[PDB]
Each structure stands twice: as C-alpha cells, then as structure tokens.
Amino acid sequence: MGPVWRKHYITYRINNYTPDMNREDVDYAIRKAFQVWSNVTPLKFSKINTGMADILVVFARGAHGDFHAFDGKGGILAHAFGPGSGIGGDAHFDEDEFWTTHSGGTNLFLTAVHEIGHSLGLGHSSDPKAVMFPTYKYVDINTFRLSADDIRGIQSLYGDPKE
Ligand SMILES: O=C(O)C[C@@H](O)CCc1ccc2c(c1)Cc1ccccc1-2
Ligand SMILES: [Ca+2]
Ligand SMILES: [Zn+2]
Ligand SMILES: [Zn+2]
C-alpha cells in the first residue's frame, strides 16, 4: 500500500497561468481533468482562489525550487507529487511546452489527467492504452476515456462512486 488522500473532499488552486491559452481554457482543462477521476471514485474536487489548497497547480520552467528542474521544450512535460502534506499532491507543468486546448502542441487536459493521477497516488502503467502510460500521446478530448487499467488502479485506492 501507498499514500492516499485521507478525505473525499479535495481542493485545488491554480497558482499561476500559462500565457499559451486564455484563463477560461486553463481553468476548464484543469476542471475537466479532475472530473475524469471524480467520475470513477467517491472523490470531490473544488477550485479555491485563496488559502492553502490540497493540490497546487503550477506552471514553471527549468529549476523552480523542488529539486526536480524542468528541461526546456520537449522531454518531461510535467510532474506531480503523490498525496502528502506541503508539496504533496502538487502538479507542475513545464512552462517551456506550448500548452493547447487541442492538438496544436502539448494538450493541457490530457497532460493534467495524467498528472492528477499522480497527485491521487497512481504510478505508471505498462498498458499502452492507459492515461498513466509514461508516454504522452494525443487523443481527441471528446473521445477520451480512462482505460480499464486506470479505473481499476484508481478504485483500488479510493473505491468506486456511491449509490
Ligand atoms: O508525469 C510524467 O510521467 C511526465 C510527463 O512528461 C508524462 C505526461 C503524459 C504521459 C502520458 C499521457 C499524457 C501525458 C497525455 C495522454 C493522453 C492519452 C494517453 C496517455 C497520455
Ligand atoms: Ca520539458
Ligand atoms: Zn516541480
Ligand atoms: Zn507520469
């Protein structure tokens, strides 16, 4: 067993914004990415704009204070820390990527779903169909669905939604 959030009500806050997409689009990509996970577990996600959140969403480039320096455009697109206190649960996106609403470059929604998986406690999958597969790949955001491995992985940690 590994660390999990010990409550079902989880807050997130967007620390700062990429200049690559307007605010509405960043907010929606992130909201929609939490929604993918909340759809298959008992978890509830809420955005806050003040106070300390459980999960901080940050856009940063190169070294940014966590011993895990980003590496410019390409390579690592983002990273996240599992459930814990302090930096635990936070999701960092490499500001050097070009973030898009679709496939124009690095899709934020898809990348966020993968990172939130990490913030919830999931590690990598060996199933090429899984969002937790280590390698980024675009899929139409209207056609996107967690794979069966993602769902069983997340439910083993938090159970399924209630009656
Ligand atoms: O957190 C990490 O492991 C580092 C990161 O560069 C991997 C980002 C990533 C990894 C995998 C995927 C995506 C993004 C988007 C996607 C859509 C559909 C299926 C898989 C993936
Ligand atoms: Ca990078
Ligand atoms: Zn970081
Ligand atoms: Zn990953």
Side-chain angles (χ1 to χ4, degrees), residues 98-108 110 136-141:
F98 179 60
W99 299 105
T100 62
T101 52
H102 296 90
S103 58
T106 304
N107 189 262
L108 182 56
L110 293 169
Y136 175 94
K137 214 180 176 193
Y138 187 76
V139 168
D140 180 20
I141 57 73

PDB file of all heavy atoms in Angstrom, residues 98-108 110 136-141:
ATOM      1  N   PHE A  98       4.349  24.207 -25.192  1.00  0.00           N
ATOM      2  CA  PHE A  98       3.322  25.087 -25.690  1.00  0.00           C
ATOM      3  C   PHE A  98       2.009  24.384 -25.381  1.00  0.00           C
ATOM      4  O   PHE A  98       1.684  23.334 -25.945  1.00  0.00           O
ATOM      5  CB  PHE A  98       3.543  25.380 -27.190  1.00  0.00           C
ATOM      6  CG  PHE A  98       2.496  26.287 -27.785  1.00  0.00           C
ATOM      7  CD1 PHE A  98       2.306  27.567 -27.285  1.00  0.00           C
ATOM      8  CD2 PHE A  98       1.727  25.868 -28.853  1.00  0.00           C
ATOM      9  CE1 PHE A  98       1.362  28.391 -27.806  1.00  0.00           C
ATOM     10  CE2 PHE A  98       0.775  26.705 -29.393  1.00  0.00           C
ATOM     11  CZ  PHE A  98       0.583  27.970 -28.865  1.00  0.00           C
ATOM     12  N   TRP A  99       1.268  24.947 -24.443  1.00  0.00           N
ATOM     13  CA  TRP A  99       0.033  24.340 -23.988  1.00  0.00           C
ATOM     14  C   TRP A  99      -1.148  24.722 -24.871  1.00  0.00           C
ATOM     15  O   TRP A  99      -1.359  25.897 -25.120  1.00  0.00           O
ATOM     16  CB  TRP A  99      -0.212  24.712 -22.523  1.00  0.00           C
ATOM     17  CG  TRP A  99       0.871  24.218 -21.681  1.00  0.00           C
ATOM     18  CD1 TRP A  99       1.879  24.952 -21.120  1.00  0.00           C
ATOM     19  CD2 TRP A  99       1.143  22.837 -21.357  1.00  0.00           C
ATOM     20  NE1 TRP A  99       2.737  24.111 -20.429  1.00  0.00           N
ATOM     21  CE2 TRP A  99       2.310  22.815 -20.568  1.00  0.00           C
ATOM     22  CE3 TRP A  99       0.499  21.629 -21.640  1.00  0.00           C
ATOM     23  CZ2 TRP A  99       2.851  21.630 -20.061  1.00  0.00           C
ATOM     24  CZ3 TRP A  99       1.041  20.444 -21.136  1.00  0.00           C
ATOM     25  CH2 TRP A  99       2.212  20.461 -20.362  1.00  0.00           C
ATOM     26  N   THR A 100      -1.921  23.734 -25.318  1.00  0.00           N
ATOM     27  CA  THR A 100      -3.082  23.979 -26.191  1.00  0.00           C
ATOM     28  C   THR A 100      -4.404  23.353 -25.710  1.00  0.00           C
ATOM     29  O   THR A 100      -4.401  22.473 -24.845  1.00  0.00           O
ATOM     30  CB  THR A 100      -2.795  23.449 -27.594  1.00  0.00           C
ATOM     31  OG1 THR A 100      -2.580  22.031 -27.529  1.00  0.00           O
ATOM     32  CG2 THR A 100      -1.528  24.146 -28.184  1.00  0.00           C
ATOM     33  N   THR A 101      -5.530  23.850 -26.243  1.00  0.00           N
ATOM     34  CA  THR A 101      -6.871  23.333 -25.937  1.00  0.00           C
ATOM     35  C   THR A 101      -7.071  22.032 -26.715  1.00  0.00           C
ATOM     36  O   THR A 101      -7.891  21.181 -26.334  1.00  0.00           O
ATOM     37  CB  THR A 101      -7.987  24.302 -26.390  1.00  0.00           C
ATOM     38  OG1 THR A 101      -7.782  24.634 -27.771  1.00  0.00           O
ATOM     39  CG2 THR A 101      -7.991  25.578 -25.567  1.00  0.00           C
ATOM     40  N   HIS A 102      -6.328  21.899 -27.815  1.00  0.00           N
ATOM     41  CA  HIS A 102      -6.381  20.693 -28.651  1.00  0.00           C
ATOM     42  C   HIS A 102      -5.009  20.106 -28.964  1.00  0.00           C
ATOM     43  O   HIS A 102      -4.151  20.060 -28.089  1.00  0.00           O
ATOM     44  CB  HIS A 102      -7.232  20.936 -29.907  1.00  0.00           C
ATOM     45  CG  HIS A 102      -8.667  21.207 -29.587  1.00  0.00           C
ATOM     46  ND1 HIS A 102      -9.153  22.476 -29.352  1.00  0.00           N
ATOM     47  CD2 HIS A 102      -9.707  20.362 -29.384  1.00  0.00           C
ATOM     48  CE1 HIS A 102     -10.436  22.403 -29.048  1.00  0.00           C
ATOM     49  NE2 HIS A 102     -10.796  21.132 -29.057  1.00  0.00           N
ATOM     50  N   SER A 103      -4.796  19.682 -30.210  1.00  0.00           N
ATOM     51  CA  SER A 103      -3.533  19.050 -30.610  1.00  0.00           C
ATOM     52  C   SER A 103      -2.501  19.981 -31.226  1.00  0.00           C
ATOM     53  O   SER A 103      -1.519  19.502 -31.799  1.00  0.00           O
ATOM     54  CB  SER A 103      -3.781  17.902 -31.586  1.00  0.00           C
ATOM     55  OG  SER A 103      -4.462  18.350 -32.751  1.00  0.00           O
ATOM     56  N   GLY A 104      -2.703  21.289 -31.130  1.00  0.00           N
ATOM     57  CA  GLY A 104      -1.750  22.232 -31.723  1.00  0.00           C
ATOM     58  C   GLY A 104      -0.347  22.050 -31.180  1.00  0.00           C
ATOM     59  O   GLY A 104       0.621  22.400 -31.822  1.00  0.00           O
ATOM     60  N   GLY A 105      -0.234  21.481 -29.984  1.00  0.00           N
ATOM     61  CA  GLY A 105       1.064  21.258 -29.347  1.00  0.00           C
ATOM     62  C   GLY A 105       0.844  20.285 -28.210  1.00  0.00           C
ATOM     63  O   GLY A 105       0.308  19.193 -28.439  1.00  0.00           O
ATOM     64  N   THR A 106       1.237  20.651 -26.989  1.00  0.00           N
ATOM     65  CA  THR A 106       1.027  19.755 -25.849  1.00  0.00           C
ATOM     66  C   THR A 106      -0.348  20.030 -25.229  1.00  0.00           C
ATOM     67  O   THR A 106      -0.590  21.111 -24.657  1.00  0.00           O
ATOM     68  CB  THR A 106       2.158  19.862 -24.791  1.00  0.00           C
ATOM     69  OG1 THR A 106       3.423  19.613 -25.420  1.00  0.00           O
ATOM     70  CG2 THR A 106       1.969  18.800 -23.646  1.00  0.00           C
ATOM     71  N   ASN A 107      -1.261  19.068 -25.350  1.00  0.00           N
ATOM     72  CA  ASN A 107      -2.613  19.216 -24.803  1.00  0.00           C
ATOM     73  C   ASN A 107      -2.602  19.313 -23.283  1.00  0.00           C
ATOM     74  O   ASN A 107      -2.092  18.426 -22.613  1.00  0.00           O
ATOM     75  CB  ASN A 107      -3.472  18.033 -25.230  1.00  0.00           C
ATOM     76  CG  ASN A 107      -4.929  18.222 -24.880  1.00  0.00           C
ATOM     77  OD1 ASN A 107      -5.405  17.706 -23.857  1.00  0.00           O
ATOM     78  ND2 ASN A 107      -5.633  19.028 -25.677  1.00  0.00           N
ATOM     79  N   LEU A 108      -3.133  20.393 -22.723  1.00  0.00           N
ATOM     80  CA  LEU A 108      -3.137  20.553 -21.266  1.00  0.00           C
ATOM     81  C   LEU A 108      -4.080  19.556 -20.509  1.00  0.00           C
ATOM     82  O   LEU A 108      -3.700  18.972 -19.481  1.00  0.00           O
ATOM     83  CB  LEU A 108      -3.475  22.002 -20.891  1.00  0.00           C
ATOM     84  CG  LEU A 108      -3.463  22.298 -19.384  1.00  0.00           C
ATOM     85  CD1 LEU A 108      -2.081  21.922 -18.734  1.00  0.00           C
ATOM     86  CD2 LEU A 108      -3.876  23.764 -19.063  1.00  0.00           C
ATOM     87  N   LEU A 110      -5.197  16.531 -21.337  1.00  0.00           N
ATOM     88  CA  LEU A 110      -4.677  15.166 -21.288  1.00  0.00           C
ATOM     89  C   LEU A 110      -3.513  15.081 -20.324  1.00  0.00           C
ATOM     90  O   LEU A 110      -3.476  14.212 -19.465  1.00  0.00           O
ATOM     91  CB  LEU A 110      -4.287  14.685 -22.681  1.00  0.00           C
ATOM     92  CG  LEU A 110      -5.443  14.504 -23.676  1.00  0.00           C
ATOM     93  CD1 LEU A 110      -4.842  14.292 -25.072  1.00  0.00           C
ATOM     94  CD2 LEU A 110      -6.405  13.337 -23.325  1.00  0.00           C
ATOM     95  N   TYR A 136       3.378  10.564 -23.470  1.00  0.00           N
ATOM     96  CA  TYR A 136       2.313  11.408 -23.964  1.00  0.00           C
ATOM     97  C   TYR A 136       1.841  10.978 -25.343  1.00  0.00           C
ATOM     98  O   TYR A 136       2.646  10.577 -26.160  1.00  0.00           O
ATOM     99  CB  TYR A 136       2.793  12.844 -24.078  1.00  0.00           C
ATOM    100  CG  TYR A 136       1.775  13.776 -24.696  1.00  0.00           C
ATOM    101  CD1 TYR A 136       0.901  14.510 -23.897  1.00  0.00           C
ATOM    102  CD2 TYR A 136       1.689  13.926 -26.077  1.00  0.00           C
ATOM    103  CE1 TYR A 136      -0.038  15.369 -24.454  1.00  0.00           C
ATOM    104  CE2 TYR A 136       0.757  14.782 -26.639  1.00  0.00           C
ATOM    105  CZ  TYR A 136      -0.101  15.507 -25.819  1.00  0.00           C
ATOM    106  OH  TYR A 136      -1.032  16.365 -26.372  1.00  0.00           O
ATOM    107  N   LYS A 137       0.537  11.054 -25.590  1.00  0.00           N
ATOM    108  CA  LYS A 137       0.010  10.819 -26.921  1.00  0.00           C
ATOM    109  C   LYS A 137      -1.344  11.523 -27.036  1.00  0.00           C
ATOM    110  O   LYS A 137      -2.181  11.404 -26.142  1.00  0.00           O
ATOM    111  CB  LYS A 137      -0.115   9.327 -27.229  1.00  0.00           C
ATOM    112  CG  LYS A 137       0.145   9.008 -28.714  1.00  0.00           C
ATOM    113  CD  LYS A 137       0.024   7.516 -29.006  1.00  0.00           C
ATOM    114  CE  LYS A 137       0.180   7.216 -30.490  1.00  0.00           C
ATOM    115  NZ  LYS A 137      -0.251   5.807 -30.757  1.00  0.00           N
ATOM    116  N   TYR A 138      -1.549  12.283 -28.112  1.00  0.00           N
ATOM    117  CA  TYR A 138      -2.816  12.987 -28.297  1.00  0.00           C
ATOM    118  C   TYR A 138      -3.965  12.057 -28.631  1.00  0.00           C
ATOM    119  O   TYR A 138      -3.801  11.109 -29.377  1.00  0.00           O
ATOM    120  CB  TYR A 138      -2.736  14.018 -29.419  1.00  0.00           C
ATOM    121  CG  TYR A 138      -3.987  14.869 -29.492  1.00  0.00           C
ATOM    122  CD1 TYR A 138      -4.196  15.872 -28.565  1.00  0.00           C
ATOM    123  CD2 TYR A 138      -4.976  14.656 -30.470  1.00  0.00           C
ATOM    124  CE1 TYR A 138      -5.337  16.659 -28.596  1.00  0.00           C
ATOM    125  CE2 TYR A 138      -6.135  15.437 -30.504  1.00  0.00           C
ATOM    126  CZ  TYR A 138      -6.292  16.449 -29.561  1.00  0.00           C
ATOM    127  OH  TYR A 138      -7.392  17.264 -29.534  1.00  0.00           O
ATOM    128  N   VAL A 139      -5.131  12.355 -28.069  1.00  0.00           N
ATOM    129  CA  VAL A 139      -6.395  11.702 -28.412  1.00  0.00           C
ATOM    130  C   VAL A 139      -7.466  12.789 -28.319  1.00  0.00           C
ATOM    131  O   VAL A 139      -7.374  13.702 -27.482  1.00  0.00           O
ATOM    132  CB  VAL A 139      -6.746  10.484 -27.500  1.00  0.00           C
ATOM    133  CG1 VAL A 139      -8.193  10.045 -27.715  1.00  0.00           C
ATOM    134  CG2 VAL A 139      -5.787   9.305 -27.769  1.00  0.00           C
ATOM    135  N   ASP A 140      -8.461  12.718 -29.191  1.00  0.00           N
ATOM    136  CA  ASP A 140      -9.489  13.737 -29.218  1.00  0.00           C
ATOM    137  C   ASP A 140     -10.116  13.823 -27.845  1.00  0.00           C
ATOM    138  O   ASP A 140     -10.588  12.834 -27.302  1.00  0.00           O
ATOM    139  CB  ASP A 140     -10.547  13.438 -30.285  1.00  0.00           C
ATOM    140  CG  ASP A 140     -11.649  14.494 -30.326  1.00  0.00           C
ATOM    141  OD1 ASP A 140     -11.442  15.631 -29.820  1.00  0.00           O
ATOM    142  OD2 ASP A 140     -12.727  14.185 -30.882  1.00  0.00           O
ATOM    143  N   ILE A 141     -10.140  15.023 -27.303  1.00  0.00           N
ATOM    144  CA  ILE A 141     -10.625  15.220 -25.963  1.00  0.00           C
ATOM    145  C   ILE A 141     -12.110  14.897 -25.781  1.00  0.00           C
ATOM    146  O   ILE A 141     -12.572  14.692 -24.657  1.00  0.00           O
ATOM    147  CB  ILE A 141     -10.184  16.615 -25.433  1.00  0.00           C
ATOM    148  CG1 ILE A 141     -10.666  17.747 -26.351  1.00  0.00           C
ATOM    149  CG2 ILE A 141      -8.632  16.686 -25.378  1.00  0.00           C
ATOM    150  CD1 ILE A 141     -12.175  18.040 -26.275  1.00  0.00           C
TER     151      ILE A 141
END
